[PDB]
Amino acid sequence: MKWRMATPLLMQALPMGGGDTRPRFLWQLKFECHFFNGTERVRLLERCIYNQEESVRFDSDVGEYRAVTELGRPDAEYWNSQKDLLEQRRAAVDTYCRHAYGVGESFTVQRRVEPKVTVYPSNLLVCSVSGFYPGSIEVRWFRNGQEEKAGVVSTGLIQNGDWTFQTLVMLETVPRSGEVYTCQVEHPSVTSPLTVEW
Amino acid sequence: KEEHVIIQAEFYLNPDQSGEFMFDFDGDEIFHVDMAKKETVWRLEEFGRFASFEAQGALANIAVDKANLEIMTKRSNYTPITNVPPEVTVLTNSPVELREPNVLICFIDKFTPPVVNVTWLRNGKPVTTGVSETVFLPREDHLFRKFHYLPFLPSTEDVYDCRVEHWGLDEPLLKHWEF
Predict the structure, then answer these.
(1) Superfamily name with CATH number, domain B81-179
(2) Taking a contact as any Cβ pair under 8 Å apart, which residues of chain B between 37 and 96 contact chain A?
(3) Which residues of A touch B63 (CB under 8 A)?
(4) How is the protein disposed in the membrane (chain B)?
(5) Residue burial B61-88, b: 16+ Cβ < 10 Å; e: rest
């Protein structure tokens, strides 16, 4: 079960051997596991950031530490000299990234929540698509089997922050009697396109 | 072709002495570590059925982070962070319909350092009922994101305000929402 964590490295406390409006100093650390085509190719980036500006990075593609800014020179050289913590990070793509994938894959990669669709007038016809996951989605308007790519405006994808998404796609038209409108949504969470008619 | 990205994001901030530890999956928080209680807090409690995490590991990491921050601060000759003011948007979880339970979302974006005081006002009145918030979410440009939530009962009479304070702001930002 246990989720695994990567540990950052200490900087040398001896650069030269033995011998409220207050200003803020920020240090950020990021372990990025990038997965390509599932787990076929996995890339690990360790990023060290001082005051929003990255100073030194480890890239699995590079296989060693590289300074990003002048501030990062001592860290790259010091850490690269430790030639068996460098070996340790090279196989982190397996021990850390790929491991976390297998553990994670169940409720992240494979997480599927069906969108809720509601259509209502506002001179406007709004198709509301909410509560879905993942974010990749395509929403199209149907006028009784005919679609227009004119007067269509979408809010784009909105991330709610609770592992759900929403989006609103409106159609510019004053709905007359007789005509039939259809909003159709395609998503990985469903096996057949969702239709809601008006 | 890239498909998914898992990001372990930590930070430390002086002189505030604040720090966080979280995992990010495609922009969504997987979990964070409650430093004071030393417990793993999953974003969705269902996540804890499938996985576990030793919360202690986060505290040790953050201590290494402070350690390296002290060195970086002195090495940079005490160069302070440049403030970046937040972008604020107020939204609802679902389309609002009268007397049917909904949730107000206050989205704070594109800001640094990760320090923000957020207050919810309704009809001029400060509210604390049922409020919640996420940790400071990571960004590729190394800025921050944060979500604030307010469950509410949609009404024609009530009016809401989201007020956000940040050092990068000229004056606090109030963002409005009405039926």
Answers:
(1) Immunoglobulins (2.60.40.10)
(2) 43-44, 46-47, 50-54, 57-58, 60-61, 64-69, 71-73, 75-76, 78-82, 84, 91, 93-95
(3) none
(4) Single-pass type I membrane protein
(5) bbebbebbbebbbebbeeeebeebebeb
